[PDB]
Design a protein around this ligand. Structure first.
Ligand SMILES: [Cl-]
Ligand SMILES: [Cl-]
Length: 272
């Protein structure tokens, strides 16, 4: 089949307001963790600002849909800022969504530290709209080296089926952060590695379904959606997004259609 991808520079709420209820299958959410100076006109803290798109994110997700929210757990208390805990706490008090998993993204390198343990992790809260959420475990199982599985097939106590399928990747993923010399680089400083996004897309969304990202940043979600046979809608408030997004396409240089303009969101919503 052929997938559709719509993109545009927009404010998250403005994007969400144009999407119908239960219209998207998966949402990739890597939000800012501090509000803007202007936001201080209508809010007194981070969650006050974030609860708006959080509620909307839930509305646009279908019954089988899910949202993956990246965030840290070491927020220090500055006004107007917060972290993944601030979001989870809020969700526990005001949302009916289920916390399916708290995934730990454990990366190999980082800065050193003398007065504490060097930070080597970031979290991913996977919230499912309902208990009927979609989940393709097989699509993300990790294979066993030709020998290790040969030994498991000898062990009659183990289920042959499970052996060939592969292992559950667990809720701790050891994946390398995107390095400065990596070809994936589009210029976005906090660009997430395609590997993490891929795993989320393959396990939490089905082929041909729609993936949404209103904090698209580098547009990695669109690149991964295209590669995995999913439709997508990516918007970012920064005008530089267009440039990144195009750069993101030059890498792709198995048929898809790219469509610019919020007025065309519908193209990526059609189930096909
Ligand atoms: Cl790393
Ligand atoms: Cl990104």
């Amino acid at each position: 089949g052929t997938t559709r991808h719509v993109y545009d520079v927009c404010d998250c709420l403005d994007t969400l307001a144009k999407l119908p209820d239960d219209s998207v299958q998966l949402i990739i959410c890597d939000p800012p963790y501090n509000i803007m100076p202007a936001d201080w006109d209508d809010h007194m803290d981070y969650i006050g600002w974030a609860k708006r798109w959080l509620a909307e994110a839930e509305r646009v997700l279908s019954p089988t849909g899910s949202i993956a929210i990246f965030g840290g757990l070491q927020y220090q208390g500055e006004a107007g800022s917060g972290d993944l805990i601030s979001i989870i706490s809020h969700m526990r008090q005001n949302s009916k969504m289920l916390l399916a998993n708290l995934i730990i993204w454990n990366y190999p390198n980082g800065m050193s530290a003398q007065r504490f343990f060097a930070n080597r992790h970031e979290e991913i809260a996977w919230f499912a709209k309902t208990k009927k959420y979609f989940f393709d475990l097989d699509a993300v199982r990790e294979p066993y080296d030709e020998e290790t599985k040969a030994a498991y097939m000898k062990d009659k106590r183990l289920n042959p089926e499970s052996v060939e399928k592969g292992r559950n990747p667990t809720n701790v993923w050891r994946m390398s952060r995107l390095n400065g010399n990596s070809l994936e680089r589009v210029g976005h400083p906090t660009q997430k590695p395609a590997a993490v996004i891929e795993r989320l897309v393959r396990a939490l969304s089905h082929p041909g379904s729609t993936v949404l990202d209103f904090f698209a940043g580098s547009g990695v979600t669109a690149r991964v959606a295209i590669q995995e046979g999913r439709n997508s809608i990516c918007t970012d408030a920064a005008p530089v997004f267009k440039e990144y997004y195009q750069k993101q396409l030059t890498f792709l240089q198995r048929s898809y259609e790219i469509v610019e303009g919020a007025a065309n969101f519908g193209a990526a919503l059609q189930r096909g």
